[PDB]
Amino acid sequence: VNSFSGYLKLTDNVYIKNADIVEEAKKVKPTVVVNAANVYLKHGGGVAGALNKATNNAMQVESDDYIATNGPLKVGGSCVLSGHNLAKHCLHVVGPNVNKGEDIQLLKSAYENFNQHEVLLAPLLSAGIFGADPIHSLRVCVDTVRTNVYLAVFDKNLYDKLVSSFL
Numbered sequence: 001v002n003s004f005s006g007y008l009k010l011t012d013n014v015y016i017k018n019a020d021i022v023e024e025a026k027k028v029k030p031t032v033v034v035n036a037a038n039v040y041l042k043h044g045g046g047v048a049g050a051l052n053k054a055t056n057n058a059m060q061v062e063s064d065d066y067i068a069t070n071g072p073l074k075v076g077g078s079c080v081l082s083g084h085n086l087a088k089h090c091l092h093v094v095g096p097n098v099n100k101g102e103d104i105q106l107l108k109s110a111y112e113n114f115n116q117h118e119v120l121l122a123p124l125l126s127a128g129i130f131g132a133d134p135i136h137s138l139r140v141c142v143d144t145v146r147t148n149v150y151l152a153v154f155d156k157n158l159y160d161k162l163v164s165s166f167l
């Protein structure tokens, strides 16, 4: 028994809620919140900018030090950094951005990172400003992640469409 509330059950291990991931993080303070990162960990907009703003830019400061030491992530890759005031840890995961020509087949590799964590609060990878088909992202999530994932999807029209079209 964990502290996530009002999530709707999709499968044995995947749950979904119509919510802003930052609001969920601040209320739950989960062990792991997933960021929809890019390879440079430049958190300007979308999930990354919303989370970073909620940390008062501390996420960006930590991320810049990480990149200066380690170089960029891979598309499909991830790193674990602090969750600051939102979570114990933030798992920064790079989904393919279809707006930059990045291979959609890398979405499965991106979701595989979630399997290294028993429970995660996460957004729908490559959705919204990343330009991928969201029904597709949810399908890949369900078929790839085996650990317990709590999805927060800001868009009500997206949330209703995702639930009502789910197979």
Ligand SMILES: Cn1ncc2ncnc(NS(=O)(=O)Cc3ccc(CC#N)cc3)c21
Binding pocket: 019, 020, 021, 022, 036, 046, 047, 050, 123, 124, 125, 126, 127, 128, 129, 152, 153, 154, 155, 158
């Ligand atoms: C950006 N942002 N900020 C907080 C937060 N929490 C959960 N989801 C987010 N965005 S999202 O993952 O891309 C899901 C999403 C949101 C909106 C749309 C509209 C279109 N078309 C499509 C898809 C969030």
